[PDB]
Amino acid sequence: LSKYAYFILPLIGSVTAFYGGLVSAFQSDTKKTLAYSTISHCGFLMVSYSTGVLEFVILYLYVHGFFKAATFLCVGNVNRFNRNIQDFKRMGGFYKYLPFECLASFVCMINLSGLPLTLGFYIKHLLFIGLVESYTLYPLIFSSLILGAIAGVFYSYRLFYSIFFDTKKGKKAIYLQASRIILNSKFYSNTSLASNLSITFLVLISYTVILYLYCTTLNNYYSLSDLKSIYINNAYSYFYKPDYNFLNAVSILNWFVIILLISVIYLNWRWSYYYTKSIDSLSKFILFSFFFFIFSKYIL
Amino acid sequence: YLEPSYFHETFGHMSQPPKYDLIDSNINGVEKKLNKQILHREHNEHKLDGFVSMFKGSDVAK
Amino acid sequence: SNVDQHELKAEMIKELSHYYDHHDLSLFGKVQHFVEHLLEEKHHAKINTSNFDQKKLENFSESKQISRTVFALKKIKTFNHDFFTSEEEMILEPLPLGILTYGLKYAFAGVDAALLTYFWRNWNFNVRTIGLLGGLVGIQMATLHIPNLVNEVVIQTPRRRALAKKYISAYGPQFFHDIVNPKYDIEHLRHLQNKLNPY
Amino acid sequence: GHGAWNENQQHYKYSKEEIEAYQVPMRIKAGPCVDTYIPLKKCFQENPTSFAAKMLDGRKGKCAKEFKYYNTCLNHWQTYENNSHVTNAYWADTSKANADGISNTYGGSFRKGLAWLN
Amino acid sequence: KNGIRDVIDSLNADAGKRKLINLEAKNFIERVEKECEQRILKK
Amino acid sequence: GDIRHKFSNEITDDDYDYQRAMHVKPPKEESLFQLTNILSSVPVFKTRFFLDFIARNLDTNSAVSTSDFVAPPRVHENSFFVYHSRELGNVIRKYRSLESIVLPGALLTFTYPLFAAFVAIPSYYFMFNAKIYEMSRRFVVRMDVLPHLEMISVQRIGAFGILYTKLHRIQDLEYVPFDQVKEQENYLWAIGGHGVDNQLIFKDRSTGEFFYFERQGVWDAKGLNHPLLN
Amino acid sequence: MSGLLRNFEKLVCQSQLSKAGHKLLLRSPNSTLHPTAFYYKRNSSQRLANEMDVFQLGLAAAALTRQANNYAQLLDQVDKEAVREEVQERITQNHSDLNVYFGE
Ligand SMILES: CCCCCCCCCCCCCCCCCC(=O)OC[C@H](COP(=O)([O-])OCC[N+](C)(C)C)OC(=O)CCCCCCCCCCCCCCCCC
Ligand SMILES: CCCCCCCCCCCCCCCCCC(=O)OC[C@H](COP(=O)([O-])OCC[N+](C)(C)C)OC(=O)CCCCCCCCCCCCCCCCC
Ligand SMILES: CCCCCCCCCCCCCCCCCC(=O)OC[C@H](COP(=O)([O-])OCC[N+](C)(C)C)OC(=O)CCCCCCCCCCCCCCCCC
Ligand SMILES: CCCCCCCCCCCCCCCCCC(=O)OC[C@H](COP(=O)([O-])OCC[N+](C)(C)C)OC(=O)CCCCCCCCCCCCCCCCC
Ligand SMILES: CCCCCCCCCCCCCCCCCC(=O)OC[C@H](COP(=O)([O-])OCC[N+](C)(C)C)OC(=O)CCCCCCCCCCCCCCCCC
Ligand SMILES: CCCCCCCCCCCCCCCCCC(=O)OC[C@H](COP(=O)(O)OCCN)OC(=O)CCCCCCCCCCCCCCCCC
Numbered sequence A: 001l002s003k004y005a006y007f008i009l010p011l012i013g014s015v016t017a018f019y020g021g022l023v024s025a026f027q028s029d030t031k032k033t034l035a036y037s038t039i040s041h042c043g044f045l046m047v048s049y050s051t052g053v054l055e056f057v058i059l060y061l062y063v064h065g066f067f068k069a070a071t072f073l074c075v076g077n078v079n080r081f082n083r084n085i086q087d088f089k090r091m092g093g094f095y096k097y098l099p100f101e102c103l104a105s106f107v108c109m110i111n112l113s114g115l116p117l118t119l120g121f122y123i124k125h126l127l128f129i130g131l132v133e134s135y136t137l138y139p140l141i142f143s144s145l146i147l148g149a150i151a152g153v154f155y156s157y158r159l160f161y162s163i164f165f166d167t168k169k170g171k172k173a174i175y176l177q178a179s180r181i182i183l184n185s186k187f188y189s190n191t192s193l194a195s196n197l198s199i200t201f202l203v204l205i206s207y208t209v210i211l212y213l214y215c216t217t218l219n220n221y222y223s224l225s226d227l228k229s230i231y232i233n234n235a236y237s238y239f240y241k242p243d244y245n246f247l248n249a250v251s252i253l254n255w256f257v258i259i260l261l262i263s264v265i266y267l268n269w270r271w272s273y274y275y276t277k278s279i280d281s282l283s284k285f286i287l288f289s290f291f292f293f294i295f296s297k298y299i300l
Numbered sequence B: 001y002l003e004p005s006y007f008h009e010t011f012g013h014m015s016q017p018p019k020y021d022l023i024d025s026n027i028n029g030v031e032k033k034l035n036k037q038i039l040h041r042e043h044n045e046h047k048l049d050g051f052v053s054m055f056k057g058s059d060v061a062k
Numbered sequence C: 001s002n003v004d005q006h007e008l009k010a011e012m013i014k015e016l017s018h019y020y021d022h023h024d025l026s027l028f029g030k031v032q033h034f035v036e037h038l039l040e041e042k043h044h045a046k047i048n049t050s051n052f053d054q055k056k057l058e059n060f061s062e063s064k065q066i067s068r069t070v071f072a073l074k075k076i077k078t079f080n081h082d083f084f085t086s087e088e089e090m091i092l093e094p095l096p097l098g099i100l101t102y103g104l105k106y107a108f109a110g111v112d113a114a115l116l117t118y119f120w121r122n123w124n125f126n127v128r129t130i131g132l133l134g135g136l137v138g139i140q141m142a143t144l145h146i147p148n149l150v151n152e153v154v155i156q157t158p159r160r161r162a163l164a165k166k167y168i169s170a171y172g173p174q175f176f177h178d179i180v181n182p183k184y185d186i187e188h189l190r191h192l193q194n195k196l197n198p199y
Numbered sequence D: 001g002h003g004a005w006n007e008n009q010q011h012y013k014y015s016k017e018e019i020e021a022y023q024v025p026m027r028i029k030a031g032p033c034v035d036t037y038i039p040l041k042k043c044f045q046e047n048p049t050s051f052a053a054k055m056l057d058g059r060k061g062k063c064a065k066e067f068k069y070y071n072t073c074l075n076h077w078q079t080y081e082n083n084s085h086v087t088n089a090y091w092a093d094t095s096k097a098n099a100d101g102i103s104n105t106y107g108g109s110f111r112k113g114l115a116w117l118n
Numbered sequence E: 001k002n003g004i005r006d007v008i009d010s011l012n013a014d015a016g017k018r019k020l021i022n023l024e025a026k027n028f029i030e031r032v033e034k035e036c037e038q039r040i041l042k043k
Numbered sequence F: 001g002d003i004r005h006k007f008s009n010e011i012t013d014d015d016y017d018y019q020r021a022m023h024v025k026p027p028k029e030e031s032l033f034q035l036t037n038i039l040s041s042v043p044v045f046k047t048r049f050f051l052d053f054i055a056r057n058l059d060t061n062s063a064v065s066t067s068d069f070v071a072p073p074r075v076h077e078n079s080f081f082v083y084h085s086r087e088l089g090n091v092i093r094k095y096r097s098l099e100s101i102v103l104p105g106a107l108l109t110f111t112y113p114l115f116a117a118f119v120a121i122p123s124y125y126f127m128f129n130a131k132i133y134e135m136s137r138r139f140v141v142r143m144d145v146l147p148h149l150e151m152i153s154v155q156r157i158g159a160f161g162i163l164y165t166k167l168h169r170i171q172d173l174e175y176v177p178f179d180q181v182k183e184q185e186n187y188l189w190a191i192g193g194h195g196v197d198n199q200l201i202f203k204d205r206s207t208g209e210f211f212y213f214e215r216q217g218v219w220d221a222k223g224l225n226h227p228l229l230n
Numbered sequence G: 001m002s003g004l005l006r007n008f009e010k011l012v013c014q015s016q017l018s019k020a021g022h023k024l025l026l027r028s029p030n031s032t033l034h035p036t037a038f039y040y041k042r043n044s045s046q047r048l049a050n051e052m053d054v055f056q057l058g059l060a061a062a063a064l065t066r067q068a069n070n071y072a073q074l075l076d077q078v079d080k081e082a083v084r085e086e087v088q089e090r091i092t093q094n095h096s097d098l099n100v101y102f103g104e
């Protein structure tokens, strides 16, 4: 029953989402990147509450909290290995030195940054399903939301690639101190076994709890407990029986994310021995994608 | 696998692999022909009935 | 006397198909849809069933009787959906396809796409390559049916025969023979009720 | 049988005390499918099942008879809430819809995106 | 008449408009059925 | 330096063998399910049918280069070649050839060709045009010199992979330092200029057209030392 | 290079290319190896000598002379006068252009 809430929650939420997403994408420090991503996700939470589906807000909160915590733990292990240097401009080729962190970070980041075919895609999908359109500043709100949503890909890719699979940029000591043959042992590791087990169990339990909440809320049979609110938003109508208009509208954002993924993957910023072969691989991928789509849809 | 919604809304509905039952092969001849025609008519009528029922039932909830 | 329901439904279908039976197709999709509608099966509003009278029940050998009972159960399910329970409905439906079938189909699609990509990139188009592509596509299409046939002939068939035996014991062969006969009243079939269904 | 999409198998309308007993979330109580929802909830209570089973079972297993009525009611409720049955018809053929106006109120303002010029 | 009054009025108007759209769709389907019946009879 | 042998329960190379998938080490032994082992064991592949299929139906040795010196066919009966592009030229050709298959195919297959075009337009203008297309337009596939005209014939890849040759007077060629163009076309050189040489850019003063030469391109010593070009 | 169910008998082996003086000529689409029509300016805002070189003027003059000779052959082998007027007009234009170019 608050006019001020109605006007302020969506605008500030979307502005914060866009700002945090872009700053996180352009960030170079791991903890700063996670902090700005947290700001962006809090903006998205504000916008979800503005839409007014408390179930969607709770789902977004759970997903963000679990995967943000897991990613924070992974980057903490990375920083400890790198001797308290949190900037990944001095991090490179850490995949071999921190094998568990690399894969755990991959999973956690793909879930955190809303990406297709991941547990974290549905939260953004539901937010866009519930977004209201009667606002006066709807153009700015929607544009900021789209930019913030797409911004996830850049920061996730930069963090993961620069930390792990980029060229070795760190000090020679970091690698040499750990590459000594004397250290080769069944006990060898640059992290803690307890830390690895804690991260693994956190990821497993987060997956299970998120699935339980998704079944409770998003299933055909609604089995969530009473929320003690008498305001019904009608947003579930576009989740149960979406129309062609909305179904095709979502495709715009899906393809925007696809193009951005292609850019961050196939775009060359430095000379390499694999420049021509990279362009050739891009051509092969495009042509194969076209033919595969043709066969799947028409020729079977 | 279980949630192809992203694929449907990003690439469209692809050709579905064949799925049918061979119950109709039990009968043969004019019996089979007439029953097949009746079933086809029933299916079309069922689709139309669903459409008209959805359109009409807007006022069911008072 | 009263307006015929089948004729009214046929007119309404002709009028309203554009809404509930129309999708968005590309140019190739529209051409294919045009070809299908040309080589379609017309929606016969009225079927003349006064020429085929019947066959005597005694003629069948108690196995064709069970098969005809399976067909009668399918017809009952098609006309009224409340006759059978969930398990019986699952038995009567085609067995849903599985990961094996889907992966086989998409692996076929992938190999075909790779072959076309190779042919275009190397400009390797000729009679032999085109024939190879056609033959491979045909073999894949033929094979895609094999999983469904195997399912229907191995799993569903014995289950359907057992269900038919159960329902024959419940009702009687003549009860389902009448239903198999096309002269059976479709309205009575719609309003029919199942003894074995608790509902 | 032959009941409307909102009525349940038994054609029984539950009272306020019964709703409070089989407490229904406000999300469902707001809509018209309380009569079809309550039997489904009672069946689930009588035969509790895991969330994994609920997700992986497409027919709701034991509670299929009640879920059929509930699903039909849910489809009608959501379709009438979002007016999708008219929006889809206009999307399929705007010109014919205007020719025989399904709903002039929506037709006068409908404008399909230029990108979707099939 | 200020504050959330405007939002409440807009929501009420939108709900009324959606109900009107549903009613118009129902009227259209009834009209189509009647026209089809009359065409069948007049033959 | 290694002390793993001092303990009976310490890890072993037999325990580390599973990392050979993710770690590059020279081969030690062949598993029963390796492609090499399968081919060498199964007698089916030893059949002359399969052997002849391998020999014929695959990339031919004729197209394989046989020397470090290449003399491509002369463009003109009196001309002599100077520069030629080997790999980036073929890659650009194959990329631009997609406009003859994907584009008509997209038009005839996609449900919403307008949506495809609306997505492609901004994609072309950002991260694609400067990435590949402008570099290809300015790319020099081949360069020969006609002495009677005192001209240079330059071959270029056009739309849909079409190859066209143009003549430029040697008197109209100038060297453009990379410093004069880096700021003007930072994005082009940022994302797409890696293949071509930055410090060997030339342009035709009369027509104002640039010439990009592949870094992994073959030059002819005789062509470079010809008095016309010196 | 690469093919499936194909024979590359007609392909040029790389051995010939590696060899020198192999006597191979390249025919490629959209190839313009003759500069005729490059420097043919029908209207000049200034003297052609100021803007163009002797090489360019000679190319233009040779092209115009060849075209004029061909049109003269057309005049010789054509009979109808009405159709011949167009040929004569084209020849006159070519002659005027040739005169100005050769004077320059
Ligand atoms: C091999 C390594 C490289 C691979 C990289 C990825 C390549 C991606 C190329 C994309 C090209 C553009 C899109 C055209 C294809 C669209 C496919 C689609 O939408 O189907 C969704 C479909 C939609 O199916 P549906 O809509 O009929 O219903 C699915 C739901 N059930 C099952 C209940 C009916 O979802 C799938 O099931 C996908 C296939 C899952 C099983 C695949 C097993 C492996 C098959 C061989 C490998 C294939 C690799 C290629 C990529 C496969 C991706 C699934
Ligand atoms: C030395 C001991 C160390 C500690 C060991 C503890 C082991 C714990 C192992 C399970 C943890 C992870 C559970 C899955 C993640 C949560 C899933 C979820 O959201 O719930 C969904 C489900 C809820 O049920 P459901 O989701 O299947 O649906 C229920 C269906 N209806 C509603 C119809 C009834 O919960 C679980 O599956 C979690 C397990 C049940 C709860 C167990 C609590 C009691 C624990 C007893 C052991 C106590 C040991 C004490 C040791 C003391 C040492 C000092
Ligand atoms: C508002 C207005 C909107 C307008 C939107 C316009 C959208 C449509 C744009 C149309 C683009 C047309 C492109 C023409 C391409 C050729 C151009 C050209 O000259 O290049 C010659 C080029 C180069 O010619 P060349 O002479 O240099 O050499 C010959 C070829 N090589 C190089 C190999 C020796 O040749 C080709 O690329 C030939 C292509 C032939 C096939 C073309 C059609 C392929 C697609 C068929 C339909 C889709 C698949 C269907 C499958 C069905 C299976 C059952
Ligand atoms: C009409 C004028 C000419 C238009 C030319 C077409 C656009 C330019 C060339 C595009 C080539 C790339 C086609 C990829 C097709 C992939 C499968 C598919 O979804 O096709 C059907 C769909 C469209 O078919 P549809 O319209 O039937 O789909 C239903 C509608 N949607 C999807 C919106 C719900 O393809 C596309 O959406 C293509 C969008 C344009 C892409 C423009 C270039 C950016 C991508 C770079 C190339 C690599 C992309 C790889 C993608 C892999 C999978 C994510
Ligand atoms: C005009 C059409 C309507 C849409 C309007 C909007 C146009 C598109 C705007 C995209 C802005 C993206 C900003 C990303 C910033 C990332 C910063 C970062 O992390 O560093 C760079 C990181 C790389 O980080 P790195 O660490 O690997 O290296 C950095 C190297 N330096 C510092 C030298 C630059 O990512 C990128 O480089 C990719 C971003 C550049 C390419 C952008 C391509 C845009 C394609 C738009 C497609 C539109 C599809 C059509 C539909 C759109 C609307 C629905
Ligand atoms: C009388 C005898 C008659 C005999 C008749 C039968 C003969 C045998 C027919 C089947 C076997 C054909 C011959 C085996 C080799 C086939 C090779 C092929 O299909 O092309 C590979 C091609 C490589 O790239 P390309 O640009 O063509 O480079 C040329 C290199 N020479 O690939 C590409 O272009 C790249 C495509 C992929 C792009 C990225 C996606 C990666 C995944 C692709 C997987 C494709 C394989 C199938 C798996 C699908 C599921 C993943």
Ligand SMILES: CCCCCCCCCCCCCCCC(=O)OC[C@H](COP(=O)(O)O)OC(=O)CCCCCCCCCCCCCCC
Pocket (backbone or CB within 6 Å): A286, F098, F099, F103, F117, F120, F121, F123, F124, F128, F133, F137, F158, F159, F160
């Ligand atoms: C409304 C248009 C919608 C899109 C239409 C796409 C048409 C594609 C076919 C183009 C054929 C002619 C090309 C001419 C080239 C030339 O010499 O182009 C020369 C022109 C003119 O020169 P300048 O503009 O540099 O001065 O350059 C241009 O930039 C204008 C034309 C741009 C054509 C771009 C074609 C590629 C599009 C790629 C889309 C994104 C990638 C898609 C996946 C691979």
